[PDB]
Design a protein around this ligand. Sequence first.
Ligand SMILES: [Cl-]
Length: 177
Amino acid sequence: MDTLLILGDSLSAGYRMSASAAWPALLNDKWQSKTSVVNASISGDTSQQGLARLPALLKQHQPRWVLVELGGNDGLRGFQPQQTEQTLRQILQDVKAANAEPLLMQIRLPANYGRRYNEAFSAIYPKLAKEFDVPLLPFFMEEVYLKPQWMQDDGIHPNRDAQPFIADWMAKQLQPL
Ligand SMILES: [Cl-]
């Protein structure tokens, strides 16, 4: 079996829920005996904190692909987009140099954040996917935001009931990869 490594923040770890409640556990169950899914996600992680954890994970897991789901905390904290871009660039360099295929997820801030900064933050992702010639996955939360029954009260993080949707959505996005 090949291994999919997830390098993520609470959108993949689960916000205020157990790891086993989060969609990557559901995906792992769905892909039993075919593909291993390692959820190396930490609630609250910046792109810099993800990057710090990455080398040990690459060594240990020798994954075939790495899903990079990071930078949203940087954006939510108003960090400079150029800085989050460089950090993400380093993550992508590390992945390729370990002989793994990076899969970069587009991240955005919710629709009530100011539009100029959200635009500059969001733009980093297609720029990096083009630069590294890697898949750019769409942001799964854009669908989730549209369902109050799947959102926690902060308007940011998906709830436990959203997790089976997200797992199914991710299974569908990831099969041609
Ligand atoms: Cl998107």
